Design a protein around this nucleic acid. Structure first.
Ligand SMILES: [Mg+2]
Ligand SMILES: [Zn+2]
Ligand SMILES: [Zn+2]
Ligand SMILES: [Zn+2]
Ligand SMILES: [Zn+2]
Lengths: 43, 241, 100, 94, 159, 85, 171, 486, 65, 56
DNA sequence: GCTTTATTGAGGCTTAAGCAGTGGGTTCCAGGTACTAG
DNA sequence: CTAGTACCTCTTAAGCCTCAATAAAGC
């Protein structure tokens, strides 16, 4: 299961205002204490 | 007399300075020449440098005897291949051993002893010390030239062959009994049933079981030969079964 | 070639010894009736540049306090002639034999 | 050809453990090494012609087991031993 | 180090493991019981071979030798030597005698090795028994030791 | 003692294949032997994956005067399915 | 020393010999292995009992090889001498340094220095024997001796004993 | 590849304890004391030195004395070096500093005890790493050992802990040799640190995380450097000893010089320089790249390669020869589209099919087919090139002129050329996802380009613009079944 | 707070304390016990105090005060 | 963890701590060249001595 | 009331990490220097 | 004389040490 999940999460990254795309995935995977484009949503 | 030569803080003060290996003698000579030139030029004002020396076995360092560090730093300033910054104070207790001559690895030469020639066309050839000069500067060595054959010498180079005695022949300027004598510089020259194994001797590598021990001689039955062999205890090692 | 005297340890070229001999032991050699070459050896270890023999502890350690400033050898191999030894009751060889 | 790490994990995902074992132990470098059952070290004296097995480190006569591993594995183990690191290969779970 | 002071090895513990993982007490046997179990094993082997193939110091020794030759014969010559050693100087010839001996030794509750030695080795005096096994000195009362020794001596078969 | 699968028959007496000689596989192009102290072969085998007719051979002297050899081999390659355009 | 215990043996079988009679071959190989075995760890194996009740665990198939590895657990009786024990044997040969005594599957040697003073070797009889003031020793004799040392061989066990305490020797 | 009587069984666990000097001496069959790797005339290896025959066979045609084996079966043996002066381990230098800070510099006892509540809380941590970190933090917080500690129940009353009272210096980490400050800064002797480690009791380093059975704080201070056997230091033909052999020779020369200096009068001045040089050489041998220190330069124009470098990254053994290693039975070449091929069917060049082989075992079912393949010979595509007998020896067919006279027997194996309907794994090097490596049925074609179905291009992300793909042929029935079914 | 000294010719035996509140630089040696004081600024550094001390020593030695 | 970016530091840490590896991971078996407990290798295949007789 | 504490945290410097696979062409057999064998 | 032979030469994640306030205990 782990290897399948890793491959399924990595394939879109290879295929590919607010940071998005590969930089966002790298930030999410890393601890990312400092946020390049921090955001908050309130309703 | 040497008891009164013990170094003291108020009498001996030597500082070590790092230098490039292989330039110790040249650096010492250059420093001595510079000191002489400074003494000749400046005149009354002379740097307080008492001696500069080095040790062959201790490469990459020189030693200067001065009363103050600043004097050494000024004297050595601008001298290539000397790291004045990388300097340390030599403790007094270490001063004697620093100047103590190194124990030469050459064993005391004795008549009939076997040695190996370091320099010469017979490199790697065993030699026998026959005689030692009174000045202890040259030693006579007997070596194998294959043994000298008077017949072949007479057949080939009789012009350079001379006979001094029934067993003495001179060839190309001294062969005795087929061996060449030449002068060389000294600097150029247990319990029963225990498993035991032979580590040294004629039976080296043999293993067996001890049966009797007496007066330091251990007798063991050897499986390889199935016979009792008696060997000195020091030449046997107890092997764990 | 450079040779170091077996008596005082001074190191000098063979030409200097042949021409002028040892500046510090010429008289002793002449008294002993021996040549300078026989009292000098080509094998030596270590080099010492003595500048103030009278005020240098190294000179006292090497027994060259009364000698002149110059190049000396810490260790010199060989033995002096028997005549020189007889004239120097307190002679100490520089080969390290008496440094036990 | 080189069996890349990405290919290795792709095969792992495929679940073909037998294929990976064959590829990394049969189609590639293959070695057979002897290890004691007490010290678990590859330094075992094994004379196959004499059929004599003995390890000097531990006083054991017949406690040796043979394992098939890649030559790279034993090279790594020896390199670690050079670093005073001893991978103790054991055939049983404690 | 292994000696007679009950300092057994790392494997000769007082407790033993079973095929099912249960822990039992170590059990020993004497020469007569050893011969009985060996004979039973030989009979079982002979029966197994037969079914598979289907689809006074002068006569007993010959029968034992021929039985050994028929099954597990020729593989090693040490088995015959061990069998001869066991048979030549055995003590009990009847199953009932060995059964009674083991039943009596069970009541003592001593170490299996000690009871095996007592049932195998022969002793006649308390001092001889004590010096034979110094470790088992302050474990068995003198009266009990004498009683068991005389019982064993009486139980000896007359060949 | 060191002999390779390369066929030395193509080599002439001089040790160099002349132009117009068919060479393939590990066939030796230059025959060189280094004396050992009697000698060990040091020939330059042809590329295993490439083959063709030797086009030219030249022999000269290097800067230090040592003998030097250069052999150019020519092959005709026709378009195939795997070729890239 | 005559101890019954459970021993586990691993036996490898080729996949070809997977017929109905494979059990017979496995049992034959087990008999050929256990009999004559002599290892210092487990001592000397004497016999294996309950042949018909031998249970064989499910075989293990190698990850790549087709061989099957069966771990068979069997109850067996084994013999292992210990230091300080007293055992009886029969003299097998005589020598100047002593006489070897066969006991069970093992041999025992008595040191000359640890022999009675009265006992003395004699070559006047064929074969050479030993004479004592109150005992007689020959090739065919039952001798009870104490074992003081044990030596383990690749496939043999040796004992070193002595006869100094009373009630020892010929009986 | 020789028969062995040792039982066969895979490894199930791997302990990673330290290698004790006593174990080194016990297992080190030979002793290395000659820096020269060869004897006079460069014919026989130096006895009791580098490349000694006892460690292994330097070159073919000679059998290792220890094992009487050549190159195929020769794991190698290590040698023990005296190393009179202990040398800090580069990898454990931080561990050495932490242990020294955690224990007294005189009594070799843990600075704190169970009396302190914080120490008890730290010990409560089951994890070795976190517990050791907490203990180190608490110890560095303390600055002086106390012989008597206040009692928690009675703060006024104190209980004698058994300490001395010596202050704990602030140990620094500068260069190979650490310096401690009490303030006066001084270099702590390696012998003193080794003695302190030896004085550590079982409980102390057991709490610190060192397993007594397989590790000890003293064992970190290496007093003997194992000598890798010849296989670890192959001689490259140009003998051409590797850089590691040169580093070992330099270390041995340094040790010999240090021993000679010690035996020929030790002024203690140059002894420090010799010891520092030996430590630097050992550290470079174990780790050439040392942060904030000069890198040892090999005699040639290249930095010396060390074991740490050899196990650094992709080029290292871990990621270069274990996680990913080269394969024998495999081919690589360009791919071309082919609408006339089935989805699971992949075209294969005839030459690649001939080169690639499968070891099919001889059976009565296909005895005739295998005999026909053998008769065809390696040159003909439907044939074979090698025949494996029962003994395991392999006989080639092209070199043997009597191939047609060979009668196959049951149990033998023949390396037959891959035929049609033969599963093989087709892959593209950028294995981005799981579906980048799939099994295809071989279809032999008379062209030098792999051919695959049009659809399978999408999972492979292929575009036939020069893409090169790899085909791996299974070499066993197990592998074939797994590829076909999984 | 480590600097060389000229009276005892010992390195790293000198310590300098800079009181910016009082703007005073005090240099003291731990071996010969020599103490010197000078005026300093907020931008002053121990090297400045050492240079001032050396200049004062030179002036005293020259006798041109 | 050795197979990751940190290679020799983890080895030194394990040596200092004498860490024990159960070899249940993929990397351990891959390095040892043994069938990992993965899919096909997760379980083991045995032989039934009672079903074989009746199947014959 | 004043003095000395353990704690808190906050940044500088540091040591690490840095797609996969494949094909090929160039260059290193290191510079000078002293000592010694034919 | 001449030529061998060896020999000295760009973007973050954690660790640690070093810094400036702060509430309690000594006294
Ligand atoms: Mg493309
Ligand atoms: Zn072992
Ligand atoms: Zn070997
Ligand atoms: Zn203490
Ligand atoms: Zn001062």
């Amino acid at each position: 299961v782990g290897v399948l999940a890793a491959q399924s999460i990595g394939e879109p990254a290879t295929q590919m205002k607010v940071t998005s795309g590969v930089p966002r995935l790298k930030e999410i995977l890393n601890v990312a204490k400092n946020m390049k484009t921090p955001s908050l949503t309130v309703y | 007399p040497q008891r009164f030569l013990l170094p003291s803080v108020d009498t001996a003060t030597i500082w070590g300075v790092r230098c490039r290996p292989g330039k110790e003698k040249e650096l010492i000579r250059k420093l001595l020449k510079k000191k002489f030139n400074l003494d000749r030029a400046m005149g009354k004002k002379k740097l307080k440098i008492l001696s500069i020396f080095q040790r062959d076995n201790y490469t990459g360092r020189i030693y200067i005897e001065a009363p103050k560090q600043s004097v050494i730093e000024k004297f050595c300033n601008g001298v290539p291949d000397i790291y004045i910054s990388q300097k340390l104070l030599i403790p007094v207790q270490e001063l004697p051993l620093l100047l103590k001559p190194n124990k030469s690895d050459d064993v005391a030469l004795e008549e009939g002893s076997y040695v190996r020639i370091k320099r010469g066309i017979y490199k790697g050839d065993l030699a026998m010390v026959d005689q030692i000069s009174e000045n202890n500067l040259e030693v006579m060595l007997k070596i194998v030239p294959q043994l000298f054959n008077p017949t072949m010498a007479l057949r080939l180079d009789q012009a350079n062959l001379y006979k001094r005695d029934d067993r003495h022949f001179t060839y190309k300027n001294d062969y005795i009994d087929g061996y060449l004598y030449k002068s060389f510089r000294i600097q150029h020259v247990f319990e029963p049933g225990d498993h035991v194994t032979v580590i040294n001797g004629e039976h080296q590598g043999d293993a067996g079981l001890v049966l009797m021990v007496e007066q330091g001689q251990v007798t063991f039955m050897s499986t390889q030969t199935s016979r009792e062999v008696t060997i000195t205890a020091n030449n046997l090692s107890k092997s764990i079964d | 070639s450079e040779r170091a005297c077996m008596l005082c340890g001074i190191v000098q070229t063979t030409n200097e010894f042949n021409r002028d001999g040892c500046p510090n032991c010429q008289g002793i050699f002449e008294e002993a009736g021996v040549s300078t070459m026989e009292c000098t050896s080509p094998s030596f270890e270590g080099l010492v540049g003595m500048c103030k023999p009278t005020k240098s502890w190294v000179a006292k350690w090497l027994s060259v306090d009364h000698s002149i400033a110059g190049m000396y050898a810490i260790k010199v191999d060989g033995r002096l002639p028997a005549e020189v030894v007889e004239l120097l009751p307190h002679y100490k060889p520089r080969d390290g034999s008496q440094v036990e | 050809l080189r069996f890349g790490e990405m290919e290795r994990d792709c095969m792992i995902a495929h679940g073909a453990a037998s294929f990976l074992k064959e590829r990394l132990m049969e189609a590639s470098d293959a070695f057979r090494v002897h290890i004691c059952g007490i010290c678990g070290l590859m330094t075992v004296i094994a004379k196959l012609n004499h059929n004599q097995f003995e390890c000097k480190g531990c006083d054991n006569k017949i406690d040796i087991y043979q394992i098939h591993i890649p030559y790279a594995a034993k090279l790594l183990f020896q390199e670690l031993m050079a670093m005073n690191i001893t991978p103790r290969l054991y055939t049983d779970r404690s | 180090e292994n000696a007679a002071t009950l300092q057994l090895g790392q494997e000769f513990q007082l407790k033993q493991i079973n095929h099912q993982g249960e822990e039992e007490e170590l059990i020993a046997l004497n020469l007569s019981e050893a011969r009985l179990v060996i004979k039973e094993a030989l009979v079982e082997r002979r029966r197994a071979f037969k079914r598979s193939q289907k689809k006074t110091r002068e006569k007993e020794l010959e029968s034992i030798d021929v039985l050994l030759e028929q099954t597990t014969g020729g593989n090693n010559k040490d088995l015959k030597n061990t069998m001869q050693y066991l048979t030549n100087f055995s003590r009990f010839r009847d199953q009932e005698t060995v059964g009674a001996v083991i039943q009596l030794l069970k009541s003592t509750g001593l170490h299996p090795f000690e009871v095996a030695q007592l049932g195998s080795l022969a002793c006649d005096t308390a001092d001889e028994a004590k010096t034979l096994i110094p470790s088992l000195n302050n474990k068995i009362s003198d009266d009990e030791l004498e009683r068991i020794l005389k019982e064993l001596s009486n139980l000896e078969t007359l060949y | 003692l060191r002999m390779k699968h390369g066929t030395y028959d193509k080599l002439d007496d001089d040790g160099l294949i002349a132009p117009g000689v068919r060479v393939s596989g590990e066939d030796v192009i230059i025959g060189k032997t280094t004396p050992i102290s009697s000698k060990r072969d040091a020939s330059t085998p042809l590329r295993s994956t490439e083959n063709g007719i030797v086009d030219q051979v030249l022999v000269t002297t290097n800067q230090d005067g040592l003998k030097f050899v250069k052999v150019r081999v020519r092959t005709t390659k026709i378009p195939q399915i795997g070729d890239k355009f | 020393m005559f101890f019954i215990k459970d021993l586990s043996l691993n036996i490898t079988l080729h996949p070809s010999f997977f017929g109905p009679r494979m059990k017979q071959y496995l049992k034959t190989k087990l008999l050929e292995e256990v009999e004559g075995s002599c290892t210092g760890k487990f001592g000397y194996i004497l016999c294996v009992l309950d042949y018909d009740n031998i249970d064989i665990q499910r075989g293990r198939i190698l990850p790549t090889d087709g061989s099957a590895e069966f771990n068979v657990k069997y109850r067996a009786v084994v013999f292992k001498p210990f230091k300080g024990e007293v055992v009886d044997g029969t003299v097998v040969s005589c020598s100047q340094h002593g006489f070897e005594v066969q006991v069970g599957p093992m041999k025992v040697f008595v040191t000359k220095h640890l022999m009675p003073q009265d006992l003395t070797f004699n070559a006047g009889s064929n074969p050479p024997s030993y004479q004592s003031s109150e005992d007689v020793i020959t090739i065919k004799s039952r001798i009870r001796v104490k074992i003081e040392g044990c030596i383990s061989q690749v496939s043999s066990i040796h004992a070193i004993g002595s006869i100094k305490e009373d009630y020892l020797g010929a009986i | 590849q020789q028969y062995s009587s040792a039982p066969l069984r895979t490894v199930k666990e791997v302990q990673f304890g330290l290698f004790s000097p006593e174990e080194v001496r016990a297992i080190s069959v030979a002793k290395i004391r000659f820096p020269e790797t060869m004897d006079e005339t460069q014919t026989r290896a130096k006895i009791g030195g580098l490349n000694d025959p006892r460690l292994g066979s330097i070159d073919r045609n000679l059998k290792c004395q220890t094992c009487q084996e050549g190159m195929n079966e020769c794991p190698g043996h290590f040698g023990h070096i005296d190393l009179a002066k202990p040398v800090f381990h580069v990898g454990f230098i931080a561990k050495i500093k932490k242990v020294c800070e955690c224990v007294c510099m005189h009594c070799g006892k843990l600075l704190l005890d169970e009396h302190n509540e914080l120490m008890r809380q730290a010990l409560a941590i089951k994890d070795s790493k976190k517990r050791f970190a907490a203990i180190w933090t608490l110890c560095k917080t303390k600055m002086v050992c106390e012989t008597d500690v206040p009692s928690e129940d009675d703060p006024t009353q104190l209980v004698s802990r058994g300490g001395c009272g010596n202050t704990q210096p602030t140990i620094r980490k500068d260069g190979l040799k650490l310096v401690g400050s009490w303030p006066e800064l001084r270099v702590l002797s390696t012998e003193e640190i080794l003695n302190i480690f030896k004085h550590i009791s079982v409980k102390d380093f057991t709490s610190l995380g060192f397993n007594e059975v397989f590790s000890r704080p003293e064992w970190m201070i290496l007093t003997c450097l194992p000598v890798p056997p010849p296989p670890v230091r192959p001689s490259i033909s140009f003998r051409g000893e590797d850089d590691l052999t040169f580093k070992l020779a330099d270390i041995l020369k340094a040790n010999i010089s240090l021993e000679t200096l010690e035996h020929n009068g030790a002024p203690h001045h140059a002894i420090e320089e010799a010891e520092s040089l030996l430590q630097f050489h050992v550290a470079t041998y174990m780790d050439n790249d040392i942060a904030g220190q000069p890198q040892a330069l090999q005699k040639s124009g290249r930095p010396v390669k060390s074991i740490r470098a050899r196990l650094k990254g992709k080029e290292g053994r871990i990621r270069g020869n274990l996680m990913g290693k080269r394969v024998d039975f495999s081919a690589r070449t360009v791919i071309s589209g082919d609408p006339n091929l089935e989805l699971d069917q992949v075209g294969v060049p005839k030459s690649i099919a001939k080169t690639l082989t499968y070891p099919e075992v001889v059976t009565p079912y296909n005895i005739d087919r295998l005999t026909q393949l053998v008769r065809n010979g390696p040159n003909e595509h439907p044939g074979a090139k090698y025949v494996i007998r029962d003994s395991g020896d392999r006989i080639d067919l092209r070199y043997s002129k009597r191939a047609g006279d060979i009668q196959l027997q049951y149990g033998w194996k023949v390396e037959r050329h891959i035929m049609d309907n033969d599963p093989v794994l087709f892959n593209r090097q950028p294995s981005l996802h799981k579906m980048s490596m799939m099994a295809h049925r071989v279809k032999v074609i008379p062209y030098s380009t792999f051919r695959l179905n049009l659809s399978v291009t999408s999972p492979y992300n292929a575009d036939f613009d020069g893409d090169e793909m790899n085909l791996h042929v299974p070499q066993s029935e197990e592998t074939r079944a797994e590829l076909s079914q999984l | 707070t480590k600097f060389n000294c000229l009276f005892c010719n010992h390195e790293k035996s000198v310590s300098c304390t800079l009181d910016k509140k009082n703007s005073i630089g005090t240099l003291s040696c731990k071996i010969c016990g020599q103490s010197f004081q000078t005026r300093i600024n907020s931008l002053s550094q121990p090297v400045d105090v050492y240079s001032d001390w050396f200049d004062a020593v030179e002036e005293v030695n020259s006798g041109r005060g | 963890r050795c197979s990751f970016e940190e290679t020799v530091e983890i080895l030194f840490e394990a040596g200092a701590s004498a860490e024990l590896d159960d070899c249940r991971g993929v990397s351990e078996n891959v390095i040892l060249g043994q069938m990992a407990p993965i899919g096909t290798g997760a379980f083991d295949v045995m032989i039934d001595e009672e079903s074989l007789v009746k199947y014959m």
